[PDB]
Amino acid sequence: AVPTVVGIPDGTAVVGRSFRVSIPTDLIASSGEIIKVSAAGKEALPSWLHWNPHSHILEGLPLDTDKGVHYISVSAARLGANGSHVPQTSSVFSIEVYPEDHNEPQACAADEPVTVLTVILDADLTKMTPKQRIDLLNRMQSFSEVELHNMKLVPVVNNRLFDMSAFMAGPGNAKKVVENGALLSWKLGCSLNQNSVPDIRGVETPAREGAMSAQLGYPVVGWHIANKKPT
């Protein structure tokens, strides 16, 4: 009698940046009902998302191939005496994945380069689940002193494991690079130079000694600091 309708607001995401939203399951599910979260019209989520049923958190880390709008269905079903799932309600919202974070947490002055620290990892993000992508970011926090949601994680492109414009850099623990590679990066400041970069020993030393890779779960190829043209 008199069903309730819950609207969930649409969200936004950016390639290479962590995504996290709470879903109001206590409003959608009358006691006893089973919640399902999927891509609308499918049983699975999009490949970049992960649903935590006990925390009610939908989270993910999109790749360039996830650009665009994703409709997500949150549905509640009654479990019948015979084991059937009787759907009761469905609430659908969308998430638009945008292509570029412009190296900004979300800023430097216009046309002022952003100083970015990048760690190059022997990893293939397309082989990793969303949870694995997020946990790699989580594991980097000890070293970056940047929160999960302000780091960036994207694949290597054109097989380039270096940045020749970098004015500081150093080695990791890896001797071979087996996978395509991943770039895990964050902002240090605006238009910095060697003399104004913060203390980076807490990156460079564990990178070279192998303590960083032991904590991240992936081999570290190297790191570098470079000023990136603004976008």
Author numbering: 58 to 163, 179 to 303
Publication passage describing the model:
Dystroglycan (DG), a ubiquitous membrane receptor belonging to the glycoprotein complex associated to dystrophin, plays a crucial role in the stability of the plasma membrane, especially in skeletal muscle tissues where it is highly expressed. A single gene, DAG1, encodes for a protein precursor, which is proteolytically cleaved in two subunits, alpha-dystroglycan (α-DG), located at the extracellular side of the plasma membrane where it binds several extracellular matrix proteins, and beta-dystroglycan (β-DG), which is a transmembrane protein that interacts with dystrophin in the cytoplasm. The molecular structure of the N-terminal region of α-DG (α-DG-Nt) was later determined at high resolution by X-ray crystallography, revealing the presence of two domains, an immunoglobulin-like (Ig-like) domain and a domain similar to the small subunit ribosomal protein S6 of T. termophilus (S6 domain), connected by a flexible loop. Noteworthy, it has been shown that α-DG-Nt is necessary for recruiting LARGE and some pathological conditions that are caused by missense mutations in the DAG1 map within the α-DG-Nt.
The crystal structures of D109N and V72I have been determined to a resolution of 1.70 Å and 1.80 Å, respectively. The Asp109→Asn mutation introduces local changes on the molecular geometry that are quite evident in the final refined model. The Asn109 side chain rotates nearly 120° around Cα-Cβ with respect to the orientation held by Asp109 in the WT. The conformation assumed by Asn109 allows for the establishment of H-bonds with Lys203, Glu116 and His107. Accordingly, Asn109 is not engaged anymore in H-bonds with Ser112 and His111 as Asp109 is in WT. In addition, the H-bond network involving Asn109, Glu116 and Lys203 in D109N abolishes the interaction between Lys203 and Glu116 observed in the WT structure. In this respect, it must be emphasized that the Asp109→Asn mutation not only changes the H-bond network involving residue 109, but also modifies the local electrostatic potential, so that the interaction of Asn109 with the surrounding positively charged residues like Lys203 and Arg77 is affected. This is confirmed by the presence of two water molecules (HOH 548 and 621) absent in WT structure and coordinating Arg77, thus filling the void left by the Asn109 side-chain relocation. In details, the mutations Asp109→Asn and Thr190→Met led to a significant increase in the maximum dimensions (with Dmax increased from 90 ± 3Å for WT to 95 ± 3Å and to 100 ± 3Å for D109N and T190M respectively) and in the Rg values (from 25.20 ± 0.04Å for the WT to 26.40 ± 0.04Å and to 27.20 ± 0.04Å for D109N and T190M, respectively), suggesting a more extended shape of the two pathological mutants compared to the WT protein.
